């Protein structure tokens, strides 16, 4: 299927235990997409003060369209330095890996895989 219905466990910045998913923007984009197939990825909303405290590169969720079942459709796009790769709507968070954190809220979305 081009597109998977996912609920992300959406976790507290200072809760994170693993602040990014690796090294280099391709890296980075290559794990996000693993960790949402395993079931393994989680969900910081962006807020003032939350990116300074996570790894880049960032792997950001962006909504890709104006909502089957309820899910938001979403696509990755990653930052280093100030510069993204890929083009999209508004971030709905940045993903970090989940290593059983206690969530706050899930996000249901559709991610373009």
Do not use: N, W
């Amino acid at each position: 299927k081009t597109h998977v219905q996912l609920s992300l466990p959406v976790l507290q910045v200072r809760d994170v235990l693993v602040r990014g998913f690796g090294d280099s923007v391709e890296e980075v984009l290559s794990e996000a997409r693993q960790h949402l197939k395993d079931g393994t990825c989680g969900l910081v909303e962006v807020e003032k003060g939350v990116l300074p405290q996570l790894e880049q590169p960032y792997v950001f969720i962006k909504r890709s369209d104006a909502a089957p079942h309820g899910h938001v459709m979403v696509e990755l796009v990653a930052e280093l330095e100030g510069i993204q790769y890929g083009r999209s709507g508004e971030t709905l968070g940045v993903l970090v890996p989940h290593v059983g954190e206690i969530p706050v809220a899930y996000r249901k979305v559709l991610l373009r895989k």
